[PDB]
Design a protein around this ligand. Structure first.
Ligand SMILES: Nc1ncnc2c1ncn2[C@@H]1O[C@H](COP(=O)(O)OP(=O)(O)OP(=O)(O)O)[C@@H](O)[C@H]1O
Ligand SMILES: Nc1ncnc2c1ncn2[C@@H]1O[C@H](COP(=O)(O)OP(=O)(O)OP(=O)(O)O)[C@@H](O)[C@H]1O
Ligand SMILES: Nc1ncnc2c1ncn2[C@@H]1O[C@H](COP(=O)(O)OP(=O)(O)OP(=O)(O)O)[C@@H](O)[C@H]1O
Ligand SMILES: [Mg+2]
Ligand SMILES: [Mg+2]
Ligand SMILES: [Mg+2]
Ligand SMILES: [Mo]
Ligand SMILES: [Mo]
Ligand SMILES: [Mo]
Ligand SMILES: [Mo]
Ligand SMILES: [Mo]
Ligand SMILES: [Mo]
Ligand SMILES: [Mo]
Ligand SMILES: [Mo]
Ligand SMILES: [Mo]
Ligand SMILES: [Mo]
Ligand SMILES: [Mo]
Ligand SMILES: [Mo]
Ligand SMILES: [Mo]
Ligand SMILES: [Mo]
Ligand SMILES: [Mo]
Ligand SMILES: [Mo]
Ligand SMILES: [Mo]
Ligand SMILES: [Mo]
Ligand SMILES: [Mo]
Ligand SMILES: [Mo]
Ligand SMILES: [Mo]
Ligand SMILES: [Mo]
Ligand SMILES: [Mo]
Ligand SMILES: [Mo]
Ligand SMILES: [Mo]
Ligand SMILES: [Mo]
Ligand SMILES: [Mo]
Ligand SMILES: [Mo]
Ligand SMILES: [Mo]
Ligand SMILES: [Mo]
Ligand SMILES: [Mo]
Ligand SMILES: [Mo]
Ligand SMILES: [Mo]
Ligand SMILES: [Mo]
Ligand SMILES: [Mo]
Ligand SMILES: [Mo]
Ligand SMILES: [Mo]
Ligand SMILES: [Mo]
Ligand SMILES: [Mo]
Ligand SMILES: [Mo]
Ligand SMILES: [Mo]
Ligand SMILES: [Mo]
Ligand SMILES: [Mo]
Ligand SMILES: [Mo]
Ligand SMILES: [Mo]
Ligand SMILES: [Mo]
Ligand SMILES: [Mo]
Ligand SMILES: [Mo]
Ligand SMILES: [Mo]
Ligand SMILES: [Mo]
Ligand SMILES: [Mo]
Ligand SMILES: [Mo]
Ligand SMILES: [Mo]
Ligand SMILES: [Mo]
Ligand SMILES: [Mo]
Ligand SMILES: [Mo]
Ligand SMILES: [Mo]
Ligand SMILES: [Mo]
Ligand SMILES: [Mo]
Ligand SMILES: [Mo]
Lengths: 244, 267, 267, 244, 244, 267
């Protein structure tokens, strides 16, 4: 088994659609994050949200390949990260670039309590072919990092309570049953949309350290605080990493 | 039309099968359709020094007169030494991937210095190195073949060796830029039924599909096995050619359409 | 002569009127006098996708045979979304300016990938991209139109929207490099007495000076209003042309000296 | 009104002409700065001084435009910043680049008590036309940053006591009357030289947070200490930002 | 005499051949380094080792000049530094690049107790001609930095006890006598191999601050701890800088 | 053969005389054999402004038609001002070296802006700037002459002035890239027995070896004295030429093989 590089680290991924709600959603989340700073050492990673859909719409209309779209969407996650970091600047928090996250996170988390980065992985023009939509997005990037570091946890902060049997905002609203607990293998066998990347389920299958990931609703204050303490307030996804 | 796709992109999750099906109907633009991507093996060629590299440099200089080339370098023995040191410490695949990149960069630097007097640069962003690729006096670029994944490298099912190395790095670039050909320059004539350095009665295979290679359970480490799965999902590069770069004129012959070596097809 | 200026530069404050008057007598060197700067609108063109971008790409490829071009990109709707999110949080103009730059970079990347096979690169430092601009096979570069001010953006009198965006960014580059022409490629034929999307009896204006535009209190958001003040202080580019890029051949016609669209003059 | 990003920050701009005096002026200033480190969180920004005049002299003789001269002068301010930072290195102070000041100041000021940067803004080739001398120089850059961050203050450290009615080292020496207090609007209406950029007065007119700026003599030990405590030891410039 | 920029700094250079031994040598060294973190402020610099010999072998076979080989070997020292830094990441230690070591070491050592860097100096294509083997390697780079900063000390950690009269692993094994103490001038007049760069002896002749350097065996736990406390546990090299 | 060298490289220390002797037998590859390196003096030329720079720009533009040029810039009076401020504070040579680089970069930027319309770029990595050096339309690059040593600058025996400045920086580049010629463009006709600005009966020296210069104890600060020792150890550039750039056509004449100025030989 590989060693844990930063065993004391907590990684939090904030969905781009949470950021897309603006001040109504960001201000209570910022206030909750401020209160968490003295409790944990955090790597906060942001997703892309709706602006990545607009750039996919233009990019696909121009016929651009999947490797062209990947860095364009990643830029949106980076911009959400600069917005979130600016809101926490007075607390000593800043946005750090991917090379800094990859090689110097330890020194940055010694200087301050949290840093913000883009959750997108730097696959760029070397994105895998197959789909016209880049498969390695924000949930996948956040998990790859969390598992590579051997982090204490990974929490995914969404605009929904967790994973449902169908899209709770889609045509099948009435058939959507909440799943309090699931496994990566069980979700992989399912058809239908998910609020997490499908590639996340693939990387969870080969995970070395992270045993569970929780998907929580960032629109309900207190849920992120509770999830970071291990409380069951959303959907728990078991990765298939067996403990001792 | 594009009206349904734009509506689906706004309202559905990107994991939605309906959205995925609609995005698959989008037009297909090839960025560099006239270019050929070549991978110069690290262990198989560059590590052999002058006897292997100097004849290939002459072929590249002659070939660029008629073919637009993107030349990627492998990593080789210094990367294997770094991987064994780091694996022994229990460092994850993501750390090993960064160490391996440095070795491919050293190899691109050495090759670039032999090619500088012929106008061929070492670049970052080969596929978009529009100026050198548009000039008849240049028509080629050298790049480091390692993918940029670094700490975000997808690990293998077991072990810490990065599964996507310089064969995958060069292939994905050929694929993303919609190149017309992908040639792997190694030190074996091509694929054999058994290992050519081990078994005695291993037969040569001139052409094979990824499915047949999997079905026949081939013990040939000539190509990184994850490259075969990438080849099956590829939109632009549906076949690759493996040639022996130690045979004089083999790269020139492959660029001329000769069926030297093995052709691996997606289907 | 230069002897008085050198003495004043050493001994007086840079705010000294005598020094300022002497510095104004210095020779005027044009760095790129034969180049034309074009701005491709973000919201007006690139955001419209294939129907707008593909015909313009063909005009650019044809036009670079006879004209040296510096093609700047606008930002558009993704920047407006970032500005509304950030403004709602009370983030200052300096933060919004950095967010807007990312959108113009995305647009330059998309345009550059469609132009790569024609040898046209996406660059940083367009005005000094001496090599691509000196080759007949290239003769053009693509750049991101946002100015580099970032956190040091001069804010507007009210609100947090950066007042110097991609129209100002492209104009200042034309001005600094002493270019011969500045063309804004938008989605309206030019300037009208009233808004062409609002009022019914808005009359077209083929030619106007900045003073006349100010005196007539024009409700035309076709050009960033701070660009008009920069135009009045300009040393090299004393007029700009606004053309509709949605009309086939309009950019080609403007480069040929046809008076398509509106000409805005400094005086 | 925009939010204050770093409300606890004190920004100090050291004039390039103070640095041009060498060890006689720099050593007492360094000693005073060392004593201030435990008292404030400082962003120290350096001006350009005489070497920018030499590069303007050569550059104007070559006929170079205003956008060509701006980054050439900025380099001189950057070099003064490296000299000042080296003198304070033993205290944990270093020079940080403009991208770091713009996006990561909060983390750097969490690690250490002060950082040094170039006061010049990165207008570069996008400098405004009109004058052959770049208008956005060190005082302007320092103010734009101080006001964008919502800093607690901005102090300008000069080789003179403050602003006079005429240049106290110029031909009209005898007519030069010291101004203890002035407003940006009053100075803007004046003709004649100033020890501050004219563009500073323009940006002060649209300021959102900084109510006052003090110009003090860095050649008199103790004045910088006093100014940072709000004592009136030089010229106070009112910006026209009205308090509550 | 120039001033000491970081008088409280201890510089340690770890030989690339120590790293080449892998986990058997690295794990006890990492454990000893962990225990040293609360005691000293460290700049840890790594050498190149055997992989630089392989790249010299290929590079010389291709006929490449000395300036081409220098950055190729330096890359190996950089890779050893990333491996060592990853092992100490949980303690707040990271690898920092040469520009960061040159201009921002003070801030990085204020955030955390130690940083790792490449010991190779950035001579690159401007390496001196004369030999086909780059003369300015890891020992030389570590010394140039230590002396430029005015560091409290420089310790060289090797795979041997210190300097012998002949190579203790070479053909003349039996004639190899251990030298507990020597001077840069005495070693310079000698022929035969050394475990330190010959260029180190040249830069020691013009040194401004470092009076002595100790070469210790990193394969014997405790020797590095003892050397950092000034104990004589290897070869002391006097530089010819006379104390007060 | 290479078999003995590879064995010695693995088993011996790099300080081993046997290894050093074997490495000296390796083949010698010249990266840019057809290029000429020129140093444009900072204090001697660029600091003099228009009267000195404009005629040299015209010579460079004319000369690049027939000669591949790498043009390095000196630092000059702004670097001397930085060195006196920093020396007075007791800052070490390593800090001064970084300050000096900024001045050479400013000089390269000014020269590059006058040359941009002729297609000549300012680059980083001149010797490997393969694309501009391979085009007849370009055939030249401008680079900053300061070496990259920064804090790792070898100090002089006494004082804090960096001993390796822009003469050494340009020379080492000529040497490393195996260039055919190295020309120093200064403001004196060449070397004299005594200082031409001090003594009255100083005689001109057209040709001299480094040994003779040392033996005659020359008081000529025309060339950085450490450059003379580098010249004696050089493998590729065994002679340098010092010319007066203030004399019209002197650089053109030197490139044509005329023996204008002084030739300094290694032996
Ligand atoms: N099975 C499902 N369970 C829950 N939500 C679902 C499901 N299928 C689809 N969704 C939808 O996914 C939405 C979340 O959108 P998405 O995951 O793309 O946003 P995000 O995570 O914020 O974006 P990003 O990946 O850029 O950070 C939910 O609001 C919900 O409508
Ligand atoms: N009205 C004035 N009041 C005071 N000083 C003035 C006035 N007009 C001109 N000066 C001059 O301005 C000088 C300060 O020079 P200047 O402001 O250019 O230097 P600096 O601020 O150190 O430079 P930089 O802007 O590069 O940091 C004073 O020494 C004084 O001679
Ligand atoms: N006189 C000598 N005394 C001691 N060791 C010597 C001597 N001459 C040669 N050596 C050899 O030098 C070896 C150390 O090798 P070397 O100095 O190249 O490694 P390193 O310092 O780890 O490498 P790097 O310089 O890349 O960090 C010792 O193991 C020993 O065999
Ligand atoms: Mg989601
Ligand atoms: Mg001033
Ligand atoms: Mg050694
Ligand atoms: Mo950065
Ligand atoms: Mo970075
Ligand atoms: Mo990087
Ligand atoms: Mo960096
Ligand atoms: Mo890099
Ligand atoms: Mo950085
Ligand atoms: Mo990219
Ligand atoms: Mo890199
Ligand atoms: Mo790199
Ligand atoms: Mo390179
Ligand atoms: Mo290199
Ligand atoms: Mo390079
Ligand atoms: Mo490049
Ligand atoms: Mo790079
Ligand atoms: Mo890179
Ligand atoms: Mo990079
Ligand atoms: Mo580049
Ligand atoms: Mo790129
Ligand atoms: Mo790029
Ligand atoms: Mo290039
Ligand atoms: Mo380039
Ligand atoms: Mo950027
Ligand atoms: Mo950028
Ligand atoms: Mo790009
Ligand atoms: Mo990109
Ligand atoms: Mo690019
Ligand atoms: Mo470029
Ligand atoms: Mo950039
Ligand atoms: Mo940039
Ligand atoms: Mo940049
Ligand atoms: Mo470049
Ligand atoms: Mo530039
Ligand atoms: Mo630049
Ligand atoms: Mo370029
Ligand atoms: Mo280029
Ligand atoms: Mo940096
Ligand atoms: Mo940076
Ligand atoms: Mo940047
Ligand atoms: Mo950076
Ligand atoms: Mo950048
Ligand atoms: Mo610039
Ligand atoms: Mo970096
Ligand atoms: Mo950096
Ligand atoms: Mo640098
Ligand atoms: Mo950097
Ligand atoms: Mo740089
Ligand atoms: Mo290099
Ligand atoms: Mo630099
Ligand atoms: Mo630079
Ligand atoms: Mo430049
Ligand atoms: Mo510049
Ligand atoms: Mo440049
Ligand atoms: Mo370049
Ligand atoms: Mo650079
Ligand atoms: Mo640089
Ligand atoms: Mo650099
Ligand atoms: Mo470049
Ligand atoms: Mo290079
Ligand atoms: Mo490079
Ligand atoms: Mo270039």
């Amino acid at each position: 088994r590989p060693i844990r590089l930063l065993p004391w680290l907590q990684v939090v991924k904030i969905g781009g659609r949470v950021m897309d709600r603006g001040a109504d959603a960001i201000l209570p989340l910022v206030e909750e994050l401020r209160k968490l700073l003295p409790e944990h050492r955090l790597l906060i990673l942001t997703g892309a949200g709706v602006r990545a859909r607009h750039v996919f719409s233009v990019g696909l209309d121009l016929g651009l390949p999947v490797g062209s779209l990947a860095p364009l969407a990643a830029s949106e996650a980076g911009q959400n990260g600069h917005i979130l970091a600016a809101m926490l600047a007075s607390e000593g928090v800043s946005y750090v670039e991917h090379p800094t996250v990859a090689d110097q996170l330890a020194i940055h988390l010694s200087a301050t309590r949290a840093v913000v980065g883009s959750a997108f992985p730097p696959y760029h023009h070397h994105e895998f072919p197959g789909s016209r939509i880049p498969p390695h997005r924000a949930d996948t990037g956040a998990f790859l990092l969390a598992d590579a570091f051997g982090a204490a946890g990974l929490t995914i902060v969404e605009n929904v309570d967790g994973i449902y049997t169908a899209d709770p905002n889609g045509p099948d609203r009435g058939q959507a049953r909440f799943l309090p607990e699931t496994s990566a293998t069980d979700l992989a066998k399912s058809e239908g949309p998910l609020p997490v990347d499908r590639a996340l389920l693939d990387v969870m299958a080969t995970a070395r350290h992270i045993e569970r990931v929780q998907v929580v609703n960032g629109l309900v204050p207190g849920r992120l605080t509770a999830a970071l303490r291990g409380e069951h307030v959303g959907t728990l996804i078991r990765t298939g990493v067996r403990p001792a | 039309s594009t009206a349904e796709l734009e509506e689906l992109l706004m309202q559905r999750s990107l994991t939605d099968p309906q959205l995925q099906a609609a995005a698959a109907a989008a037009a297909d633009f090839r960025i560099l359709p006239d270019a050929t991507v070549i991978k110069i093996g690290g262990q198989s060629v560059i590590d052999r020094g002058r006897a292997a590299v100097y004849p290939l440099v002459d072929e590249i200089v002659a070939a660029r007169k008629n073919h637009k080339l993107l030349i990627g370098t492998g990593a080789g023995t210094r990367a294997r030494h770094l991987y064994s040191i780091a694996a022994g410490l229990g460092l994850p695949a993501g750390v090993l991937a960064q160490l391996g990149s440095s070795v491919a960069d050293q190899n691109a630097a050495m090759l670039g210095q032999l090619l500088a007097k012929h106008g061929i640069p070492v670049v970052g962003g080969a596929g978009l190195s529009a100026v050198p690729l548009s000039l008849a006096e240049v028509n080629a670029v050298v790049f480091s073949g390692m993918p940029p994944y670094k700490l975000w490298m997808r690990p293998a099912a077991e072990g810490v060796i990065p599964p996507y190395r310089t064969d995958a790095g060069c292939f994905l670039l050929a694929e993303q830029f919609g190149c017309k050909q992908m040639i792997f320059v190694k030190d074996e004539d091509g694929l054999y039924t058994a290992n050519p350095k081990t078994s005695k009665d291993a037969t040569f295979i001139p052409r094979i599909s990824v499915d047949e290679m999997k079905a026949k359970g081939l013990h040939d480490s000539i190509l990184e096995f994850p490259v075969l799965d990438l080849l099956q999902s590829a939109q632009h590069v549906r076949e690759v050619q493996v040639v022996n770069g130690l045979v004089p004129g083999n790269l020139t012959r492959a660029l001329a359409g000769e069926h030297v070596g093995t052709i691996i097809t997606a289907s």
